[PDB]
Design an enzyme around this catalytic site. Structure first.
Site, PDB file in Angstrom:
ATOM      1  N   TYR A   1     -41.304 -17.918 -53.581  1.00  0.00           N
ATOM      2  CA  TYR A   1     -42.006 -17.828 -52.286  1.00  0.00           C
ATOM      3  C   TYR A   1     -41.015 -17.531 -51.137  1.00  0.00           C
ATOM      4  O   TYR A   1     -40.910 -16.388 -50.671  1.00  0.00           O
ATOM      5  CB  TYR A   1     -42.788 -19.120 -52.072  1.00  0.00           C
ATOM      6  CG  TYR A   1     -43.687 -19.198 -50.834  1.00  0.00           C
ATOM      7  CD1 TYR A   1     -44.961 -18.612 -50.807  1.00  0.00           C
ATOM      8  CD2 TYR A   1     -43.277 -19.922 -49.708  1.00  0.00           C
ATOM      9  CE1 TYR A   1     -45.813 -18.748 -49.668  1.00  0.00           C
ATOM     10  CE2 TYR A   1     -44.095 -20.050 -48.583  1.00  0.00           C
ATOM     11  CZ  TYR A   1     -45.363 -19.472 -48.574  1.00  0.00           C
ATOM     12  OH  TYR A   1     -46.148 -19.662 -47.443  1.00  0.00           O
TER      13      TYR A   1
ATOM     14  N   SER B   1     -48.920 -14.418 -51.011  1.00  0.00           N
ATOM     15  CA  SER B   1     -48.903 -14.460 -49.528  1.00  0.00           C
ATOM     16  C   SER B   1     -47.476 -14.138 -49.078  1.00  0.00           C
ATOM     17  O   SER B   1     -47.048 -13.033 -49.289  1.00  0.00           O
ATOM     18  CB  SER B   1     -49.448 -15.790 -48.969  1.00  0.00           C
ATOM     19  OG  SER B   1     -49.483 -15.911 -47.515  1.00  0.00           O
TER      20      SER B   1
ATOM     21  N   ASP C   1     -60.372 -12.458 -47.673  1.00  0.00           N
ATOM     22  CA  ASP C   1     -59.064 -13.003 -47.321  1.00  0.00           C
ATOM     23  C   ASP C   1     -58.783 -12.822 -45.839  1.00  0.00           C
ATOM     24  O   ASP C   1     -58.138 -11.856 -45.440  1.00  0.00           O
ATOM     25  CB  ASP C   1     -57.914 -12.448 -48.188  1.00  0.00           C
ATOM     26  CG  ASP C   1     -56.590 -13.216 -47.948  1.00  0.00           C
ATOM     27  OD1 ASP C   1     -56.537 -14.027 -46.973  1.00  0.00           O
ATOM     28  OD2 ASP C   1     -55.621 -13.027 -48.721  1.00  0.00           O
TER      29      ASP C   1
ATOM     30  N   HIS D   1     -58.278 -16.075 -49.557  1.00  0.00           N
ATOM     31  CA  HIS D   1     -56.851 -16.215 -49.740  1.00  0.00           C
ATOM     32  C   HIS D   1     -56.487 -16.923 -51.040  1.00  0.00           C
ATOM     33  O   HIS D   1     -55.461 -16.628 -51.675  1.00  0.00           O
ATOM     34  CB  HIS D   1     -56.229 -16.946 -48.576  1.00  0.00           C
ATOM     35  CG  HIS D   1     -54.748 -16.771 -48.500  1.00  0.00           C
ATOM     36  ND1 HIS D   1     -54.151 -15.531 -48.396  1.00  0.00           N
ATOM     37  CD2 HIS D   1     -53.744 -17.683 -48.503  1.00  0.00           C
ATOM     38  CE1 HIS D   1     -52.840 -15.685 -48.365  1.00  0.00           C
ATOM     39  NE2 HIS D   1     -52.565 -16.982 -48.433  1.00  0.00           N
TER      40      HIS D   1
END
Ligand code: 2P6
Length: 710
Positions: free
Chosen positions: A473, A554, A641, A680
């Protein structure tokens, strides 16, 4: 292998923007409009080639079957007590949404209290946030449809589980905080806006307000308690102090772990809550975070990062509030991040630390900060906790890579604090003891040692021959800690895979210095860290570039898309979920303006120069060497989203298919899938969760030609 052709997609060659003298072409700007026939035809054309590619190999059905079987085990959350009653969430195994139960005692018969599954056939209406009244007799809960961040708050009387008429609209990124008089509840809402508010729109969210809703009245009667018309990005979240006497207002602007902290002594209100409160601006800047733990009279305990990147506990006395007067109750650890703190049984503090990306849990004395008890844990994460000031017990949940984990209970009225297993369920089919987790620390390009978890079958040869799935991430002060994933374990057991998780900079694993080392000018450290993780895996014999898959969501979607552009030779397959791909325009849409604290903003010349270098959308380029092509890429997004507007993936995939897809040396597929009635990711129904992981691992198996291992 490539049996399909990419869709015709119009290029608007007139779409040229000047950024500080740099001309930027954006020929797919028109995909920013979700409602046009052109964009809808684009999505449809794209799903039309992705789906049959995903479902051609027997492997999808085998994976799906195995996922259905292994994911079907009973799933409990932490009990928690509210008033006289205990509550918990529970899923029998494959229900779309988990169900909220209630009992009158810890030993008692449980009954259904709130079942979201009846609110939709396909389970696309989900709980998002809730708050009980202080006496536990009333209950507010937020519902989101199709995955949107938009919330509708509804209410119940707990006794008899009776629906009340009160309905709150236009709720997004909201607190939920009842006053202790049980009269009503604070929450946030956004002013009216033209067009849609359902998750399909891209409109920026500004001027969030703080309201108070009196129970038994219409929303139109709600009292406006705080607003910041001069600062349209500020967000004020409310909570009541443990004794009900003070409203504490935490004001955020962006995603940095910082806030203003204002308070309102409710007893000083001329006539109750009737308008803008008499806020006292205790902390009136964004230099630090102040997260309320408990108070005693006017002495307020906060978890803070002020002068302490790994976090500490301080006492601020409202009657003597200058910083030089604050007391350090639990000083900052030299290395370990203090993750969260709770107050329970009047005068205990429960502290949760992150020690090399594993949690510890300890009990401290409120008065002195002194350590009283360590709760022992295996290596893994604490993921659920309950126990508030008035409670005399706690529940907490441990999870890890190889076990769903254990819910512990501890009666804090006992002299000897023996936490006991409260719930534990085994997933037969996966024998934890056939696998190992190792942690190593690899040097990144600047020499910084980065942690990485590797999970693999015991006894394997390190000969480079295994498929590998590398996750990352790297952003927003989020620590990536061990969690249990049936889906990744099927890749291990049934696809012969090695799993890896790289704790790159930008996360919170080593406090604020780790966060700062992966943002703004230094965002490139994230990509460098993650590339160096892949190279570690290859060099040490766990995998090879052609068998390596990278994944992130994301901010992690940005991570993996950037690594594909930067090092297409290092990866065989890339799955980017709900990724931020247009780094020049992200701030324009919905809540995108909040991410500038990590990314910068293209309106600034300095920031533009960082962004343009890694923006996935603006760095798609044929690799120079004849023997190098782009990895197989799968972008996953959905039409609701509203966290990361799907235009990011649409524009990105159009670009990939035109610049790279059309070259004769590109045989790896570049595909997008846009799901419907989904957003999302939060609140995604089981049925979709299963479809999704089946798509991902089938994509992987097919691109890397991996046989199923039964
Ligand atoms: C994904 N990973 C997406 C795109 C980049 C950042 N992001 C987020 O979801 C981001 C990471 C942490 C939370 N967050 C939000 O966008 C939260 C939005 C609401 C919010 C709440 C508090 C302060 C600011 C914004």
């Amino acid at each position: 292998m490539l049996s399909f052709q990419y869709p015709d997609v119009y290029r608007d060659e007139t779409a040229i923007q000047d950024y500080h003298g740099h001309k930027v072409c954006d020929p797919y700007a028109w995909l920013e409009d979700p409602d046009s026939e052109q964009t809808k035809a684009f999505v449809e054309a794209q799903n039309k080639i992705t789906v049959p590619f995903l479902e051609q190999c027997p492997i999808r059905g085998l994976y799906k079957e195995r996922m259905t079987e292994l994911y079907d085990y009973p799933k409990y959350s932490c009990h928690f007590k509210k008033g006289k009653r205990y509550f918990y969430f529970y899923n029998t195994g494959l229900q779309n949404q988990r169900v909220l139960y209630v009992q009158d005692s810890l030993e008692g018969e449980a009954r259904v209290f709130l079942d979201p599954n009846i609110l939709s056939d396909d389970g696309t209406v989900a709980l998002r946030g809730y708050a009980f009244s202080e006496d536990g007799e009333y209950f507010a809960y937020g519902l989101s449809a199709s995955g949107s961040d938009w919330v509708t708050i509804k209410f119940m009387k707990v006794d008899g589980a009776k629906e009340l008429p009160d309905v709150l609209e236009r709720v997004k990124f909201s607190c939920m905080a009842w006053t202790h008089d049980g009269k009503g509840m604070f929450y946030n809402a956004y002013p009216q806006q033209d067009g849609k508010s359902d998750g399909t729109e891209t409109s920026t969210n500004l001027h969030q307000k703080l309201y108070y809703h009196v129970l038994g009245t219409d929303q139109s009667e709600d009292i406006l308690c705080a607003e910041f018309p001069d600062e349209p990005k500020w967000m004020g979240g409310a909570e009541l102090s443990d004794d009900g006497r003070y409203v504490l207002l935490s004001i955020r602007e962006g995603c940095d772990p910082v806030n203003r902290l204002w308070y309102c002594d409710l007893q000083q209100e001329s006539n109750g809550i009737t308008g803008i409160l008499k806020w006292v601006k205790l902390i009136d800047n964004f230099e630090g975070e102040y997260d309320y733990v408990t108070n005693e009279g006017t002495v307020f305990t906060f978890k803070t990062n002020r002068h302490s990147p790994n976090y500490r506990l301080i006492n601020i006395d409202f009657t003597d509030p200058e910083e030089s007067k604050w007391k350090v109750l639990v000083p900052e650890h030299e290395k370990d991040v203090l993750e969260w703190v709770a107050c329970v049984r009047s005068n205990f503090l429960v502290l949760c630390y992150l020690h090399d990306v594993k949690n510890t849990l300890q009990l401290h004395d409120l008065a002195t900060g002194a350590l009283l008890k360590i709760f022992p844990l295996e290596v893994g994460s604490v993921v659920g906790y309950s126990g508030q000031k008035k409670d005399t017990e706690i529940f907490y949940q441990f999870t890890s890579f190889l076990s769903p984990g254990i819910i512990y209970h501890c009666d804090l009225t006992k002299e000897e604090l023996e936490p006991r297993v409260f719930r534990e369920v085994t997933v037969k089919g996966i024998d934890a003891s056939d696998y190992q987790t190792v942690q190593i620390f690899y040097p990144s390009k600047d020499g910084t040692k980065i942690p990485m978890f590797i999970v693999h079958k015991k006894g394997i040869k390190l000969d480079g021959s295994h498929p590998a799935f590398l996750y990352g991430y790297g952003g927003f002060n989020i620590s990536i800690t061990p969690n249990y994933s049936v889906s990744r374990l099927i890749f291990v057991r049934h696809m012969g895979g090695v799993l890896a998780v790289a704790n790159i900079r930008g996360g919170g694993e080593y406090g604020e210095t780790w966060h700062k080392g992966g943002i703004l000018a230094n965002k490139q450290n994230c990509f460098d860290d993650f590339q160096c993780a892949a190279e570690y895996l290859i060099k040490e014999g766990y995998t090879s570039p052609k068998r390596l898959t990278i994944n992130g969501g994301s901010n992690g979607g940005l991570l993996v898309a950037t690594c594909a552009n930067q090092r297409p030779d290092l990866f065989g397959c890339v799955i980017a979920q709900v990724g931020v791909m247009d780094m020049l325009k992200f701030h324009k849409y919905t809540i995108g303006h909040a991410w500038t604290t990590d990314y910068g903003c293209s309106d600034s010349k300095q920031h533009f120069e960082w962004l343009i270098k890694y923006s996935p959308l603006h760095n798609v380029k044929l690799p120079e060497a004849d023997d190098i092509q782009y990895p197989s890429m799968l972008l996953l997004t959905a039409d609701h989203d509203d966290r990361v507007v799907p235009l990011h993936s649409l524009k990105f995939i159009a670009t990939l298919q035109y610049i790279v897809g059309r070259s004769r040396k590109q045989n790896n597929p570049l595909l997008i899938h846009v799901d419907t009635k989904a957003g999302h990711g939060a609140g995604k129904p089981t049925a979709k969760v299963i479809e999704e992981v089946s798509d991902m691992f089938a994509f992987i198996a097919r691109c890397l030609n991996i046989d199923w291992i039964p």
